[model samples]
Target: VPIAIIGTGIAGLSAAQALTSAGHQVHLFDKSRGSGGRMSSKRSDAGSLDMGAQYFTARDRRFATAVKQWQAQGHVSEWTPLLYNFHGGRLSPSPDEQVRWVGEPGMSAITRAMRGDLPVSFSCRITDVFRGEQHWNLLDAESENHGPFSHVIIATPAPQATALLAAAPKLASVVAGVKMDPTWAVALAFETPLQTPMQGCFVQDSPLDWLARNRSKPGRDDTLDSWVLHATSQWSRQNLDASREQVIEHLHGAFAELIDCAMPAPVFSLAHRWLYARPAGSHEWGALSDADLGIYVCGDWCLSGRVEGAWLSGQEAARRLLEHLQLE
Candidate 1:
């Protein structure tokens, strides 16, 4: 049976790996240059910065086991940064603690490492999923059609997948209940190290929500000090329609103010927006499917809003699809 997956995020990579281990050939597609979805990396003259997911924590045994495998492969490592909490415009040591892990070299490295030998069409934006008398066909950005697949797994954001599933009436209401929030991320590099005592900060009552020293993570380049700042959800929503330039300048100013420093001109600066940065809540279902229609959808939005959640959702979704396929 021919299978096609419509994402390469952690969820999509997890699903593809699961399916492939079961003797199935999976064809993957994404609109980006490579895997990682929101976990993608940004390159600079000095080094690269993780423009997406900052870090991940594993709790579930299934995900923990998977993380161990990634660790063995040198794709992941423990990240124990000096953490601070920001409440009432004050920065103090963060009391909450949990074992945190990060992708080596960059956050996207784990995703790319997890995706092994799978057929992928990068920069290929799929527009629609069509049904035929014998099998389903995919419509790409070029307005071309491809595929005669036995199964289709949608591991994209809920909105994008919902849009693609318009042709398949069976999974119409499955993703409707899913809600996602947006985030504005900015990466800044400085010629000298920051004077801040903490490596990571969780903001409160401000335009910014989080900031982290990228070099604090293991195996990251130390040639220059770099930071990744994320805007608050409410702030991001307010500026959702703002121009990229506007958002970048605003966030840079916000960070400088939070740190109480005269922000120097960053040697490197890049900004990105995550329209579906996280799920609103843990939905009742992690993976939804119409076995009869060969349609499946899964993501962190379907479960918890974390890397572990996406992995579990994708793996379980693949298992369910495998069961259905075996009955054939």
Candidate 2:
């Protein structure tokens, strides 16, 4: 029987790839309109900007080989050689001790590439999960579908996974300790170019933690001048309850402070709130298997918080699931 996997982020896509490679039928679902999840992108009149997950670096040899293949196929490219620390006025090579990469047009392209031929149902928001004697029922607020899968995987964040597994008391009990961190991102488009020292900047002890020049990155057109700014975790937490307009205005001020120039009247500005952006503290990585029900849950929150962490966690989950099925 086919496996049902929730979420279409890096974790979901990675798991789907592994499962398919093992000759298993996989059915994937995501609540969002597009794939990529946290590693997403947005387009505007100025240009296309990576609104989330500015860039990624591969540390694991397996992941590094996959990245090289993507690079050779023209799906990924080196974003930049150096990333700057604005507050300390210091510069260094990309931090992950490897080549830094971004999707061709934006970071979302990587997910799109990974999901090239997968069976994915976009915009399918799952509302609940009901376990039965021999199968599980997945409800989407308005309807339901029963699946007697040999295996099922919940690849969403901890909180979301917990909510869905509420139907299965045993599963809920095992996953109760998983936690998530909220994040807010602000995207700004400019009519004219704003002066900046480097393509990207990482701040310390500031309201805004990271800022990037979308135009300066490789695979982007210089003609389209734009910027993407991310708020610090502390700042986002305090303003989580604020109105959208209020948060945008505050971030605008923070952007000005970082640039030390008159804030440009943005041609377009928007806010994206990630209710579960990062993991709450570190935890053991990989999937948790319920042999009785043939279900599992996996994502970056299961392991580390970085992009590489998500990849590793997903691969580990696939390994565990395969082992459970006696396929490894």
Candidate 3:
């Protein structure tokens, strides 16, 4: 029987690939129309904008190799943006020299590339996971059942994972303990570019936490000047229920004030709310598993709260599962 992996983000895809490489049959499921999760890009009349994860750096040798492969496959590229720091109501060039990598055209490219040859049932949200006669079965949002799998791996956010782990109470309790924070991301596109050399900035003392020029990244649209703004976790939490229009207004004001440049009303403006943007804190556990029940849980929240962490967590989950089966 094949293993069922829910969620098609980096973690879920990573787990599926590893398990497949180990000679195991696996299937993937995602709630979204496609893959990428938070790493997915948004398409607008202005162009493709990266509203979720901006970029990622690989430090671990394992991840570095994967990045290298992606780069070789034309899925990733180096992003050397003119970085800056905005603190104390001042803007200055940042001295930090960190090598960053983003997907070739958008952040989603990485996940799209990694999803090769893997069969994923997109737009199907798994609402329940329960043990079957000899294997496991899943219940989707529409009350549809998918089942008879040798194992089940949950790669969604911790909170989402908790609800699915109900049949495995111990795993559910452990997953429920992990909390995640939300983020309000706004994308603004102006007819003309802002007169700032800074393409990206680490913001401080403002409602906005980070801002980046979308076109500054590799292979993005340059016809219009586009920027992606991420509100601080606290701000997002406070305005979690705010309307999209209100969020765009509030974040737009904050951006104009901080940029301190000739501000123009964006020809195209939008806001996205990430309910579980990232984990509130970090954890050392690469992944969580219950071998006896053939259930597993993995996500960036289970480890370092980064793209690399997500991939690592998935790999760890697969390893644990294989170990339990004495296949490795």
- On lDDT, the leading prediction is 3
Candidate 2 accuracy as TM-score: 0.90
Write down the TM-score of every candidate: 0.95, 0.90, 0.97
For model 1, how does the per-residue alpha-carbon lDDT over 115-207 read when each residue is reduced to its tens digit? 877899899999998788878788998998879877899999897898788866657666765789999888888898877767898888888
Model 2: how far is 26 from its true place, Å? 0.5
Q: Per-residue alpha-carbon lDDT of model 2 for 16-119, expressed as tens digits? A: 88888888888888888888888888766666767778888777788888889888988889866345665654344345344578888788887798888777
Best-performing candidate as measured by TM-score = 3
- After TM-score superposition, the amount by which residue 111's alpha carbon in candidate 2 deviates from its true location, in angstroms, is 1.3
Writing each residue's lDDT as its tens digit, candidate 3 over 1-328 gives 8999999999999998899989999989998998999899878888888889999999999999999999999999999999888899988889788999999888999999888878778889999998867989989999999977899999999999998998989889989999999999999999998887879989999899899998799888678999999999999999999999999999998888778579888999999999999999999999998888899999999999999999999999999998988853
Q: Give the TM-score of candidate 3.
A: 0.97
- Where does model 1 exceed 4 Å of error? 260-262
- Give the clashing pairs for model 1: none
Candidate 2 — which pairs collide? none
CA RMSD (A), model 3? 1.3
Sequence-dependent TM-score of model 1: 0.95
- Prediction 1 global C-alpha lDDT: 0.85
Clashes of each: 0, 0, 0
In terms of lDDT, which candidate is stronger, 1 or 3? 3
